[PDB]
Design a protein around this nucleic acid. Structure first.
Ligand SMILES: [Mg+2]
Ligand SMILES: [Mg+2]
Ligand SMILES: [Mg+2]
Ligand SMILES: [Mg+2]
Ligand SMILES: [Mg+2]
Ligand SMILES: [Mg+2]
Ligand SMILES: [Mg+2]
Ligand SMILES: [Mg+2]
Ligand SMILES: [Mg+2]
Ligand SMILES: [Mg+2]
Ligand SMILES: [Mg+2]
Ligand SMILES: [Mg+2]
Ligand SMILES: [Mg+2]
Ligand SMILES: [Mg+2]
Ligand SMILES: [Mg+2]
Ligand SMILES: [Mg+2]
Ligand SMILES: [Mg+2]
Ligand SMILES: [Mg+2]
Ligand SMILES: [Mg+2]
Ligand SMILES: [Mg+2]
Ligand SMILES: [Mg+2]
Ligand SMILES: [Mg+2]
Ligand SMILES: [Mg+2]
Ligand SMILES: [Mg+2]
Ligand SMILES: [Mg+2]
Ligand SMILES: [Mg+2]
Ligand SMILES: [Mg+2]
Ligand SMILES: [Mg+2]
Ligand SMILES: [Mg+2]
Ligand SMILES: [Mg+2]
Ligand SMILES: [Mg+2]
Ligand SMILES: [Mg+2]
Ligand SMILES: [Mg+2]
Ligand SMILES: [Mg+2]
Ligand SMILES: [Mg+2]
Ligand SMILES: [Mg+2]
Ligand SMILES: [Mg+2]
Ligand SMILES: [Mg+2]
Ligand SMILES: [Mg+2]
Ligand SMILES: [Mg+2]
Ligand SMILES: [Mg+2]
Ligand SMILES: [Mg+2]
Ligand SMILES: [Mg+2]
Ligand SMILES: [Mg+2]
Ligand SMILES: [Mg+2]
Ligand SMILES: [Mg+2]
Ligand SMILES: [Mg+2]
Ligand SMILES: [Mg+2]
Ligand SMILES: [Mg+2]
Ligand SMILES: [Mg+2]
Ligand SMILES: [Mg+2]
Ligand SMILES: [Mg+2]
Ligand SMILES: [Mg+2]
Ligand SMILES: [Mg+2]
Ligand SMILES: [Mg+2]
Ligand SMILES: [Mg+2]
Ligand SMILES: [Mg+2]
Ligand SMILES: [Mg+2]
Ligand SMILES: [Mg+2]
Ligand SMILES: [Mg+2]
Ligand SMILES: [Mg+2]
Ligand SMILES: [Mg+2]
Ligand SMILES: [Mg+2]
Ligand SMILES: [Mg+2]
Ligand SMILES: [Mg+2]
Ligand SMILES: [Mg+2]
Ligand SMILES: [Mg+2]
Ligand SMILES: [Mg+2]
Ligand SMILES: [Mg+2]
Ligand SMILES: [Mg+2]
Ligand SMILES: [Mg+2]
Ligand SMILES: [Mg+2]
Ligand SMILES: [Mg+2]
Ligand SMILES: [Mg+2]
Ligand SMILES: [Mg+2]
Ligand SMILES: [Mg+2]
Ligand SMILES: [Mg+2]
Ligand SMILES: [Mg+2]
Ligand SMILES: [Mg+2]
Ligand SMILES: [Mg+2]
Ligand SMILES: [Mg+2]
Ligand SMILES: [Mg+2]
Ligand SMILES: [Mg+2]
Ligand SMILES: [Mg+2]
Ligand SMILES: [Zn+2]
Lengths: 112, 150, 101, 59, 140, 117
RNA sequence: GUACCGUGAGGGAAAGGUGAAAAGAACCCCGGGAGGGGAGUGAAAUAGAGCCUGAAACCGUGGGCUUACAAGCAGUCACGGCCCCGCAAGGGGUUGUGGCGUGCCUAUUGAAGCAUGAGCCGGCGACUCACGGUCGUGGGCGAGCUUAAGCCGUUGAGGC
RNA sequence: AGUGAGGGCGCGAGCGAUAACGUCCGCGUCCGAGCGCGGGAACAACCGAGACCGCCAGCUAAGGCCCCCAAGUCUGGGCU
RNA sequence: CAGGCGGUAGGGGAGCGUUCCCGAUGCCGAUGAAGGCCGACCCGCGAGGGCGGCUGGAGGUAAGGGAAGUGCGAAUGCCG
């Protein structure tokens, strides 16, 4: 039995946020909380929400109890990209690719 | 339906060279050797025509599948009546038939069959003669057929 | 006991009850064949010059087959010459029954 | 400056190979001796406001 | 049918002596003894040669005016990096190298050759610490 | 009638990238880089079937030769005995009982010694 | 003939598809929301509106084999190891050591070339048709062969 | 139909300086199209030889037979 | 049974596949069409054709013939 939360269309670049998700893979639920609560990176916030919404789905939908949870697996898939023109010198223009993420966290009961 | 313009200059762009966007190398551009309209017809030698006509008629004649009628009693306009007359010739639908006659009534009675194709006598042509397993021809329709060929 | 034999181009070291496979021979899928001893070692030793004069290996033709594909492929650059050929080689499986002599 | 420029698309295996060092290091932390909650060393625990065993700010 | 492939070996150790032997013509046999091409099942891609011990490598002899007309070179990396070393200059300084070095040049280069060179143990004088392995007085 | 490319062009690219599996980097990912790589491996096959043939011969000779020198003599002679001795064994089986059945091979040096002179 | 671009005349896009039915997801949970988890609808929700099918490049997570004294068109032939599918024998994936190994196209007397083209992937992309010739050729007729426009018929019928 | 940019080596001549991977003819050959295979370390045209496919089979070719690297540290006579 | 089978420009021959037509008021198809993802299996020298498993959810088109917008890796190609 495993619980799952996914936050989609998060307006932040996967590279940056994946760096965070890697810090908490496999960690205890209580472990991860503090690691996020004090990570000096914008990602943490978003990662945290999913992590917390994940835990809730565990106890409120999937019957499993709070104090056994851990990050069974977690990942960041990329999603669509807000494309925007940035005007450059000599009248050439660029395109700013503003990426987005589909964060997932899978929480699981430590058996025994 | 586009502009004639050179979309950019020849050299110094860095992009490849181009003409108008109508160029069939573009998307949206023209077709290179796309099908215009055409006239797929030709004059077959009139002789070869009628030679084919006989050749096909007689082919059926060999198969036996040719039947010469001289009259149809039960028919007058309704299909059921043609269907009952069909029993005589052993025309059950187990074989496709080419019904040739002048009498509009008979034609109208039977045309609505799947296993039957109606036809005026002038309309005899080798195509229809071959797609049909059988052949059934009015005695004086067969007159013009003969009269046709030679 | 063993023997060297020679069928189809080449030579093999047989032994009774061997599952060996050579080239396409001709006895129907079940017959037999006498196969010439080039040297009959084992406990004995008999050297053939060229061939041992009496000895003989009777083998059971199991059946005939075709080997796995081989992709013969050729290609010469800047001439755009390219050919593709496939090759299944035929053969025959022999049951080594006994060594005569 | 005649404006240098990459010669070849940096291969997949070569860029990830560079990012070998990018990985983060988890914050280092200690229990606050009263509240036992998690807190970075040498800072005043934001849960109560104690450091050196003395209340220092009125959290 | 398939060619025999050896299972794991219990490599023979060999002592060989070097007073009076010609530098080169000794080496070339060490090299074949090293590769193990003297063994009936020798396989190209495996360490399965022999362990070779050399005593009296100082005593190695060479004809001609080689003894000081021959010059070994070594390239330091820098401008002016080429060092040049006479024969006995090498000898009475590092006798070991002289036979040592004439052999590496007879072993295939790359991973296996480098490994095979490793099994050769070279010494000046009549001494060798390998009473342990009990090396054999190979007497070529 | 217009006949659009449709399934065809992809199906043929499929057939290749199948063969290209195992190749490093883009040689297994891109079609155009797989087909090049396959060409090369194609000729490498061919020409190596040949080369493989002489290389087992090559091996065998060393091993025959190595066995011979245990009985004093070399290989270059050991043949000439065997040849004018009328024996006709090939190198594969020669190098076989070389390794496996040394008593028979050692017997074969005899016929050879006795013959060559 | 729009956005949009040009003072202007003029130029000139991209943008189709839930499902048979909206039955378009009430309600609870996490969250500021966004978005998810249950619940419910449906035959299908890996049909959820960014909606049929959902290829390829590209980016991930998990697993197997693998790599820190070895110089390399990236393969290949051989042997061995490990991990799977299997009576068997075999076979799949991986690769340690060994052998061998000068990309593709085009231009060329000549290219691995320090000569040209290509970042990768998908799609669009180049020897056609009409009249007239000339060879071969499959047939009809043969000292002869053939109709054109057109007219009659027909609605994939032909005949004058 | 394509070709009408050829090239290298041997030989025979002119040109050149009995220079050039020079040039231009002649007669051959090979590369071109055999950058497929073995030797010449490497090396289009030098020596061997014209690859239909398969083989863990045999003889030779040029070139070689101390180790890298297959085969003689072969045998008999000399010189440096 | 004997012999031939390197090959660029090029010439000849024989094939596979795509689209659409006659065959079709037919046959296949919700006991699953086309397309998609796999395969270590069968056939073919090959281009390819089948078979089997997962996906997909409404079309498909035989033997035999026909007519073309018919086969991409390169165009500093065009679009994404
Ligand atoms: Mg679980
Ligand atoms: Mg909390
Ligand atoms: Mg409970
Ligand atoms: Mg216009
Ligand atoms: Mg103009
Ligand atoms: Mg450009
Ligand atoms: Mg445009
Ligand atoms: Mg046209
Ligand atoms: Mg009847
Ligand atoms: Mg009709
Ligand atoms: Mg039988
Ligand atoms: Mg017996
Ligand atoms: Mg760091
Ligand atoms: Mg030696
Ligand atoms: Mg000296
Ligand atoms: Mg200096
Ligand atoms: Mg050492
Ligand atoms: Mg001592
Ligand atoms: Mg022999
Ligand atoms: Mg305007
Ligand atoms: Mg509707
Ligand atoms: Mg309520
Ligand atoms: Mg609220
Ligand atoms: Mg919601
Ligand atoms: Mg639900
Ligand atoms: Mg449901
Ligand atoms: Mg479905
Ligand atoms: Mg699924
Ligand atoms: Mg999308
Ligand atoms: Mg929305
Ligand atoms: Mg992947
Ligand atoms: Mg991975
Ligand atoms: Mg390496
Ligand atoms: Mg190298
Ligand atoms: Mg293991
Ligand atoms: Mg496995
Ligand atoms: Mg497996
Ligand atoms: Mg070589
Ligand atoms: Mg040319
Ligand atoms: Mg140019
Ligand atoms: Mg460039
Ligand atoms: Mg391009
Ligand atoms: Mg670019
Ligand atoms: Mg493209
Ligand atoms: Mg005319
Ligand atoms: Mg004619
Ligand atoms: Mg006549
Ligand atoms: Mg006449
Ligand atoms: Mg007449
Ligand atoms: Mg006429
Ligand atoms: Mg009608
Ligand atoms: Mg119509
Ligand atoms: Mg008429
Ligand atoms: Mg008229
Ligand atoms: Mg011409
Ligand atoms: Mg000309
Ligand atoms: Mg010439
Ligand atoms: Mg010439
Ligand atoms: Mg002169
Ligand atoms: Mg070469
Ligand atoms: Mg070739
Ligand atoms: Mg050569
Ligand atoms: Mg060449
Ligand atoms: Mg020829
Ligand atoms: Mg010779
Ligand atoms: Mg060699
Ligand atoms: Mg001597
Ligand atoms: Mg001598
Ligand atoms: Mg003598
Ligand atoms: Mg149809
Ligand atoms: Mg239909
Ligand atoms: Mg069923
Ligand atoms: Mg199914
Ligand atoms: Mg399909
Ligand atoms: Mg299938
Ligand atoms: Mg099955
Ligand atoms: Mg699945
Ligand atoms: Mg059809
Ligand atoms: Mg057809
Ligand atoms: Mg194609
Ligand atoms: Mg290109
Ligand atoms: Mg450019
Ligand atoms: Mg460029
Ligand atoms: Mg663009
Ligand atoms: Zn506290």
């Amino acid at each position: 039995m495993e619980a799952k939360a996914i936050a989609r269309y998060v307006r932040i670049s996967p590279r940056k946020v994946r760096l965070v998700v890697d810090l908490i893979r496999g960690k205890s639920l209580e472990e991860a909380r503090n690691i996020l609560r004090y990570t000096n990176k914008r990602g943490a916030y978003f990662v945290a929400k999913v992590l917390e919404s994940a835990a809730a789905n565990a106890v409120n939908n999937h019957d499993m109890l709070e104090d056994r949870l851990y990050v069974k697996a977690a990942y960041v898939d990329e999603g669509p990209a807000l494309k925007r023109v940035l005007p450059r010198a000599r009248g050439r223009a660029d395109i700013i690719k503003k990426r987005t993420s589909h964060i997932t966290v899978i929480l699981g009961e430590k058996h025994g | 339906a586009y502009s004639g313009r050179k979309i950019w200059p020849q050299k110094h762009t860095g992009r490849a060279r181009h003409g108008d966007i109508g160029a069939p190398i573009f998307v949206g551009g023209g077709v290179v050797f796309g099908p215009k309209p055409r006239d797929y017809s030709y004059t077959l030698p009139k002789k070869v025509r009628k030679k084919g006509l006989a050749m096909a008629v007689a082919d059926r004649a060999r198969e036996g599948k040719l039947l010469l009628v001289e009259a149809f009693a039960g028919v007058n306009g309704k299909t059921k009546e043609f269907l009952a007359w069909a029993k005589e010739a052993g025309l059950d639908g187990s074989e496709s038939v080419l019904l040739v006659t002048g009498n509009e009534l008979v034609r109208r009675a039977a045309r609505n069959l799947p296993w039957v194709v109606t036809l005026a006598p002038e309309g005899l042509n080798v195509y229809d003669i071959v797609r049909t397993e059988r052949l059934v021809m009015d005695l004086d329709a067969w007159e013009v057929f003969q009269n046709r060929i030679g | 006991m063993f023997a060297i034999v020679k069928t189809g181009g080449k030579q093999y070291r047989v032994e009774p009850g061997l599952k060996l496979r050579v080239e396409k021979l001709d006895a129907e899928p079940g017959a037999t064949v006498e196969l010439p001893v080039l040297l009959l070692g084992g406990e004995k030793t008999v050297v053939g010059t060229p061939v041992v004069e009496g000895a003989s290996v009777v083998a059971e033709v199991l059946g005939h087959g075709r080997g796995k594909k081989i992709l013969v492929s050729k290609f010469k650059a800047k001439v755009q010459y390219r050919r593709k050929k496939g090759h299944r080689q035929p053969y025959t499986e022999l049951l080594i029954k006994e060594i005569r002599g | 400056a005649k404006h240098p420029v990459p010669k070849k698309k940096t291969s997949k295996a070569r860029r990830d190979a560079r990012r070998s060092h990018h990985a983060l290091t988890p914050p280092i932390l200690v229990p606050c001796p009263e509240c036992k909650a998690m807190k970075p060393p040498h800072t005043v625990c934001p849960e109560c406001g104690y450091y050196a065993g003395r209340k220092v700010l009125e959290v | 049918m398939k060619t025999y492939v050896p299972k794991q070996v219990e490599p023979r150790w060999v002592l060989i002596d070097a007073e009076g032997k010609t530098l080169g013509r000794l080496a070339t046999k060490i090299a074949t003894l090293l590769r193990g091409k003297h063994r009936p099942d020798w396989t190209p891609n495996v360490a399965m040669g022999d362990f070779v011990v050399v005593v009296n490598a100082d005593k190695i002899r060479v004809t001609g005016k080689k003894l000081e007309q021959k010059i070994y070179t070594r390239y330091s990396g820098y401008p002016g990096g080429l060092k040049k070393i006479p024969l006995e200059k090498m000898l009475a300084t590092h006798p070991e190298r002289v036979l040592e070095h004439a052999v590496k040049g007879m072993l295939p280069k790359g991973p296996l050759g480098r490994r095979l060179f490793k099994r050769l143990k070279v010494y000046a004088g009549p001494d060798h610490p390998h009473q342990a392995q009990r090396p054999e007085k190979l007497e070529v | 009638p217009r006949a659009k490319t449709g399934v065809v062009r992809r199906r043929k690219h499929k057939k290749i990238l199948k063969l290209a599996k195992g190749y490093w980097g883009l040689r297994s990912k891109s079609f155009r880089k797989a087909r090049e790589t396959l060409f090369a491996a194609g000729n490498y096959a061919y020409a190596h079937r040949k080369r493989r043939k002489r290389d087992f011969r090559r091996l065998w000779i060393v091993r025959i030769n190595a066995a011979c020198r245990q009985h004093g003599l070399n290989y270059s002679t050991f043949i000439h005995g065997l040849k004018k001795a009328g024996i006709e064994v090939d190198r594969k089986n020669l190098a076989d009982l070389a390794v496996r059945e040394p008593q028979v091979f050692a017997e074969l040096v005899e016929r050879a010694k006795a013959a060559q002179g």
